[PDB]
Amino acid sequence: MDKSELVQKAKLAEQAERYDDMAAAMKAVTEQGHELSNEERNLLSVAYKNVVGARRSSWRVISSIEQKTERNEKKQQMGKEYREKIEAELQDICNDVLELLDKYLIPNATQPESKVFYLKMKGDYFRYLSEVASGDNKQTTVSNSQQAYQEAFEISKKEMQPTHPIRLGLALNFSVFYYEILNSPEKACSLAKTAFDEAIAELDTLNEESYKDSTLIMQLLRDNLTLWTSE
Amino acid sequence: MDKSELVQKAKLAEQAERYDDMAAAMKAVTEQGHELSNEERNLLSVAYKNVVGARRSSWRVISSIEQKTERNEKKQQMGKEYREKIEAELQDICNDVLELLDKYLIPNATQPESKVFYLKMKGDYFRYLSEVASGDNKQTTVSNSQQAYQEAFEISKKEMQPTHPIRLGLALNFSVFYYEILNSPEKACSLAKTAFDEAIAELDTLNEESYKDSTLIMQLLRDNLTLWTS
């Protein structure tokens, strides 16, 4: 099967709600090593969001049942083994995505918006590993998660306008990450305020017909600031 | 694996909506070769109903797409090839279930309630094969569905109460078989009306444990009878 055929197969699998097929199709597309179109990039992102989402969902369901269980019914030990089977798949799916990002997507990215998309995706997929990571492996995945967002963060700052909706929103994502996962409320606030203020300073340059493309995300940065400072 | 284990695994898979796992667990329980319990029997049924249901839905989605005009020869090829993938899967799923029915479930059925349940199941899964069958495979598969339903129907009339869900569901499915597979509204209406009237003529055979299931399926029978006439 060639790229055109795989892409079509991918859209058919989406329609049929067969997301693993959809993901396998777009994995193979990605492996031709060429920069993906917006259509293709969207398809891959969707494909894997859904495949990863289903196991995450299954895992939340099992963890919850495990904790309502009486703690030596040999049933309890099914929920252990089963959760662990889910986890291993979840990690397998994540490793695929990360391999694609390391090997093809990030290195071939020619434009800064694509490079930032893929770096953030890498950040997101490490975050999913961390949700089922063990003790000492859990700090590794969070650092790997931070570093990917940091790298994307730096590129937006350097290649995009303060007012750009991807830069904002990466600012938002990254600030929330410092707050929610790294327990750093002061860095979280510092980050948000800087993003907010920088875009504020260039409100000047926006078109009255589409300023909300920027303004809506800035409102969220601001909302978080007042929320986080109120604590 | 202990059954209670496999059955547990199966109840978790179900909660987790991982129906392929659920089905494998129940497959390995059925293969231990012993009559299933009402609960293991329902888990096996629910399992395969969801596993095969997902492909029946995917197939239709794709058959419907392949129905719009398509100027692109490669896109038309992929649609054809993808439908064919789903069918092969669908057929494999049905064959698994029919093997289980032939090798274990039906021959070991030791009471009429189960025997009807499994024959009804044999009909259903031969109906699903019919939906994607071709030529002579389709005459065989349709005919096999009718035989198994018909046989179940005779036993359910002879041994079960009119308001029993297994019996009402058989009528439901067998009436739907006649409408959708045999393209015969006359035979589908006659069956559904008989089973409904027979139920309502014996409300005394209702019981608390299955009142909701009985009425739910009676209402579905009714729905179908209105739709099919109007």
Contact A9 B82 (CB under 8 A): yes
Experimental method: X-ray
Q: Rounded to whole angstroms, what are the CA distances from A83 to A76, A90, A128, A132?
A: 11, 10, 15, 10
Q: What is the dihedral of CA A28, A29, A30, A35, to 10 degrees?
A: 160
B215 within 8 A of B221, measured Cβ to Cβ: no
Distance of alpha carbon B134 from its chain centroid, rounded? 20
Q: Which amino acid type is present at position A201? A: A
**CB neighbours (10 Å) of residue B176?**
19
Q: B134: part of which helix (H) or strand (E)?
A: none
Q: Which of B17, B58, B74 sits opposite A58 (nearest CB)?
A: B17
First to last CA, chain A: 56
Resolution rounded to one decimal, in angstroms? 2.5
List residues of chain B with CB under 8 Å from any CB of chain A.
Answer: 5, 8-9, 12-13, 15-18, 54, 57-58, 61-62, 65, 74-75, 77-79, 82, 86
How many Cβ atoms from other residues are within 10 Å of residue A173's Cβ?
15
| Residue in B closest to A76 by C-alpha | B8
Q: After which residues is chain A broken (C to N over 2.5 A)?
A: none
CA distances from A80 to A59, A65, A84, B12 (A): 11, 10, 6, 11
Q: What would you report as the CA-atom Rg of chain B, rounded to the nearest whole angstrom? A: 19
Contacts made by residues A218-227, CB under 8 angstroms, sequence distance 24+: A218/A168, A220/A172, A221/A168, A221/A171, A221/A172, A221/A175, A221/A192, A221/A193, A221/A195, A221/A196, A222/A192, A222/A196, A224/A172, A224/A175, A224/A176, A224/A179, A224/A188, A224/A192, A225/A189, A225/A192, A225/A193, A225/A196
CA distance A109 to A103: 11
Tokens representing B105 are 């479930």
Q: Which helix (H) or strand (E) holds A13?
A: helix A3-15
For chain B, domains (ranges, CATH) are 1-230 (1.20.190.20)
